[PDB]
């Protein structure tokens, strides 16, 4: 993890291949968490495993915290 004098193409690749996936993954994952939450509230299905609750719990908070920082900065500036 040193400096890089390469063209912006590298960033265009990782932003359109590594980051592009992060957005999609976050969306499907957050949506899947939401639908499961309501299902447990109403359907009262068998108590989900600790790994499921811990996974979705972390993802929910981490999502909100990231959105909160991006929401406040979105007004300030997105270009240093």
Least Cα distance to 23 among 33, 12, 11, 31 occurs for: 31
Q: Cα(35)–Cα(75) distance, rounded to whole angstroms?
A: 31
Contact assessment for residue 30 and residue 59, using Cβ atoms and an 8 Å cutoff: yes
Q: How far is CA 49 from CA 36, 42, 46, 55, 56, in A?
A: 12, 18, 9, 10, 11
Domain ranges of the chain: 1-80
CB neighbour burial string for 34-73, b if at least 16 within 10 angstroms, e if fewer: eebeeeeeeeeeeeeeeeeeeebeeeeeeeeeeeeeeeee
Name the phi and psi angles at 14, rounded to 5.
-60, -35
What top-level class would CATH report for the domain 1-80?
mainly alpha
CA-to-CA separations, 58 to 23, 37, 52, in angstroms, rounded:
17, 14, 10
Contact yes or no for 36/55 (Cβ under 8 A): no
Write the CA distances from 23 to 4, 31, 52, 60, 71, integer angstroms: 25, 12, 21, 14, 16
């Amino acid at each position: 993890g040193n400096g890089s004098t390469i063209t912006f193409d590298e960033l265009q690749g990782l932003v359109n291949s590594t980051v592009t996936q992060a957005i999609l993954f976050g969306v499907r994952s957050g949506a899947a968490a939401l639908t499961l939450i309501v299902v447990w509230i109403t359907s009262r299905s068998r108590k989900t495993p600790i790994f499921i609750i811990n996974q979705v719990s972390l993802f929910l908070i981490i999502l909100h915290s990231a959105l909160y920082f991006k929401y406040l900065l979105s007004n300030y500036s997105s270009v240093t």
